[PDB]
Ligand binder design. Sequence first.
Ligand code: GN1
Ligand code: GN1
Ligand code: GN1
Lengths: 390, 390, 390
Amino acid sequence: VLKGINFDRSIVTPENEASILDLAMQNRSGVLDGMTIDILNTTSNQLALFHGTAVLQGYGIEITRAAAPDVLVDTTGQSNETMLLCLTIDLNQVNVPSGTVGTNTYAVDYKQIRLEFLDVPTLLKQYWRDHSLHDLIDPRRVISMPLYWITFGQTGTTPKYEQIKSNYIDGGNSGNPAYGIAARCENFNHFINKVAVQSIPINGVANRPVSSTASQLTNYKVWRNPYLCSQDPRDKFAPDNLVIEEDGIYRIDISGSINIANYTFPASGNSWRVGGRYFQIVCARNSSANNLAEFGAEQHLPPSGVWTRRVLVGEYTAGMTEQAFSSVATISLFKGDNFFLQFETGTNTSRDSAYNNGYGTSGTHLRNFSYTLERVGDLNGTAYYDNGTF
Amino acid sequence: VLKGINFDRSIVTPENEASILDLAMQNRSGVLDGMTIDILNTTSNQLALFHGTAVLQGYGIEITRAAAPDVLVDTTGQSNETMLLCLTIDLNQVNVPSGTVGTNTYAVDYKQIRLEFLDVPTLLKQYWRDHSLHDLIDPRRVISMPLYWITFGQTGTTPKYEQIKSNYIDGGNSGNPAYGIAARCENFNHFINKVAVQSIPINGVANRPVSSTASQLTNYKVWRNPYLCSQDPRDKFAPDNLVIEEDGIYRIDISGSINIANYTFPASGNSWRVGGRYFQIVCARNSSANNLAEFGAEQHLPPSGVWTRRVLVGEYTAGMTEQAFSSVATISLFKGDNFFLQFETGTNTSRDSAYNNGYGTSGTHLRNFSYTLERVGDLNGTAYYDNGTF
Amino acid sequence: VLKGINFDRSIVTPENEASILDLAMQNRSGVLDGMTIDILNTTSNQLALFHGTAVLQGYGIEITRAAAPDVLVDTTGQSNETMLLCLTIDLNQVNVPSGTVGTNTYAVDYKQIRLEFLDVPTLLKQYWRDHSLHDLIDPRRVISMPLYWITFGQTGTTPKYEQIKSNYIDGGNSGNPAYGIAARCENFNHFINKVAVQSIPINGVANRPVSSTASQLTNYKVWRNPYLCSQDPRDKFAPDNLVIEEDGIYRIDISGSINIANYTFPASGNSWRVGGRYFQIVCARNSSANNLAEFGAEQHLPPSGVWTRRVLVGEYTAGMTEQAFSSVATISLFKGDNFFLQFETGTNTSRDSAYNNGYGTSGTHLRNFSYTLERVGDLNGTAYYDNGTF
Ligand SMILES: CC(=O)N[C@H]1[C@@H](OP(=O)(O)O)O[C@H](CO)[C@@H](O)[C@@H]1O
Ligand SMILES: CC(=O)N[C@H]1[C@@H](OP(=O)(O)O)O[C@H](CO)[C@@H](O)[C@@H]1O
Ligand SMILES: CC(=O)N[C@H]1[C@@H](OP(=O)(O)O)O[C@H](CO)[C@@H](O)[C@@H]1O
């Protein structure tokens, strides 16, 4: 029949108020505060966390302070192994209340909640980002959130640790936790190499023109939201490519200029006209490598006919020393995709190349270049096919 | 007096937890999953829906599975008529509980919830998008959400159906359900007609240059969010105009280039200078036609002094074969408005026109053109006057 | 131990359902409707408000109608003084229930909620925007929201009032209450003064070219969200500078054109080439003045190494009468900062200036200029250092 959830005679359940908080977190789970590692209280038998709060598919979970040490996890038996420390909800277990309201002695042993060590394959089979307690088709009884990589050494030693920042809602994004900026940078300058096609390094090192003959690799400020993207884990592609961690429609903004742009000088032989040189700036996706996403997870396969290159700026050099550009596009991207930006032009510098024959600040370069990448829509349901191919 | 809602001694009601979930849906109602038509179980007496879940002004409503057929609606008496199948909340009715908690036999006949057929005028008088159970000034006791157009034939036949996608939260938008992208497209190329003022077709067919003498009508990928906009229902305007379905401040992004742009060649008679030709790209709203919104609903009237044309790009051709452009603006739009984009230039090709005398790829055209339209703000309360005129 | 909040055996508290609604308001508090001043019922003894509803760190508060006058606040004793009328939650007090459910006589005197007059320093020490009932480190028991400046005259007179619009969720922003547009304007034209560095007036008065010899100060439409920004309160800077009221990552969009742009004409002495003139449009932040934010609150100090100027457009004039530009950037801004936009160029009009020697419509000017500033991210937690310096 038609059932109301929420109406005057309805009873409201645990499962209901959880389904509602999930909705309010934009279906993101994570640590809302604390639950970082407390290394002072961390022996070779035991691993300690600080207090705090997390939401996992709508279920609120707390580690309370008392007495530090806020909570302890048994590590005895773990040795020479990298594991994930995970917070897990297991709805097969029974929570055990004791005592009574009306005294003030009501308390619960929440056996449905545990902190545990999992290997990567086990965590992936029950990872909140891919499976749900509330799922329509394959609903689960157990679901986990990974918090730290824990690499155990020798028995007797205390382990090494690396926070899983994608599962902490830190900062960046309280208010719109599943959306917002994915990556952004400050203005930088980058030397254009003498080739037809090259990537623009978006991951925080540019080849900056520094003198009339040389450029040098120079850090610039960049930020990424680790829930949404990461730097490519292969060094070959690390300067240039992002790995997308979450499916969506994304907005890419770019702006900058091309400085010391090439062009054909007015001779009398061309009727005293500037001969412009064609260039374009494109964004690109590529899903040919699997398992680039966090944990080596399986990539999400894009719909048939999906785009791979899109022109953001396409024009001729105009005969000026410096020429500015800007562009904004929305584009579909998928978990596991590489995303990057390319500069393309001809390679004959006396006929068709936007770049000249100089080096450093005498050679053609991007100046004042910056971008922002932002997640602005999801690709659930029919959007996957209607919106996901471009 | 001062009443707390939520405080230690407060009692929390149905009406309260509903007012709170509404808030969490950004005041959007709709189907959250399922509740599509189940045509296998659908006779000439009866219409069947699949299970699922919806929220209607904060009230959660469920069709449960058991035993398919997940629920049935009596169609007997309906004949040669187009109706709306609607989910309706009627707070004048009594929900009837039976049995007891503490047994496990508590159950409710929710007479406050029904599936029914309404005609368009009746649905409009009680449509959630225009009236509210929670309204300050005119609060209602009955409110509906339309799910399908149902066109009944002859007695004996089974009816035809069309989903009302604006009332399903499918995909596109889980997380920001009342906002997000309204329309977007992939890059396309469009021939510029030899006239002073023309619309740029934004609804998925362009006149693409294909040869040195001809262009041809060619589909390009486009997507629209049917909650926010639709293609104009008049064929005259269907290639070019959107109908806005929801009031708001919207962001319009455009980018592209003008290719084979015209200009006056350096002769000795102009002192060997390029004579640029003025053009502009404008966005436009027009509310002169009423009842373009879904269901023929009444348009929302804009504040006095409202804008109708805004220049996004205004400059001269620069003497290059191809010249790129980009622009981002925020603009007010109202339910029932037409929105479109125009290219404007002079019509004397030897003096003031940005376009030349060629056709197809020899004639002046937009290349790599794309847009995104996004709802970014509402126009409730004082914003209607302070923000709504531009 | 591990505590569940929300699970089958959990008890859900006041404090819990409040922490959850806060989350759903994006941690913004404010008036959701009504609670404006009711001056008809407002004597020299007493101040009257209309009914309505507010949320204060997750606690819902109501003034009910009955019988107008919807509620009264005692003003006796207040004289020749500007005060803040504030809604305050005081969790040290006891709410006093009376009567019984099962009769229909249950009622509560909510002594935890009061309307009161505070001076500015007292309000600031307990202002919801800077302190929280839920705070991790310094949790409070009392918290306030200011609603009106109330300036009391002579005993016998009734007071003057000014609404605190930052604390009313009016309009603009229902759905994304802590984010969305901060400021926006319609297209305007502004004369470029003959100086190296000048601000572009963004606060609704431009110096519009009106004739071949003159410009004139002319209003244009602008809007600001008073939760996020305000016009600078110092007249010296009021045409040009915003004060940021809320920390965040913001997006700035600009577009427009430079009209009657200067350049060096092709003589035979430069080999018949256009000599372009460099200009740039920059956005700027400055935190050197403290206490510009609402109420004279303390500015939030930016991380060490924070940006102060960023180039949005940097290029040469191209020899055309009018040249368009556009740019989009994300930038960090802090409570108390000034934000403004600058046009920079050389000052020798026969060599390096983008501007010429004319005035009014004969002189170089911005045309069709507009902007939008939007809050798109927060700077809580680690984002303050990782994202906040640029
Ligand atoms: C299997 C593999 O490593 N492919 C690389 C390679 O793609 P191909 O489609 O194989 O060219 O170059 C891409 C960048 O150009 C990178 O994104 C990708 O992961
Ligand atoms: C009554 C009517 O059909 N008006 C049309 C017509 O507007 P007028 O203001 O009537 O020119 O042209 C518009 C597009 O240019 C279209 O938006 C509109 O609906
Ligand atoms: C103490 C003071 O008033 N400083 C002014 C002044 O900054 P200085 O850093 O002091 O130049 O000019 C700024 C605008 O250029 C304005 O933002 C600021 O408030």
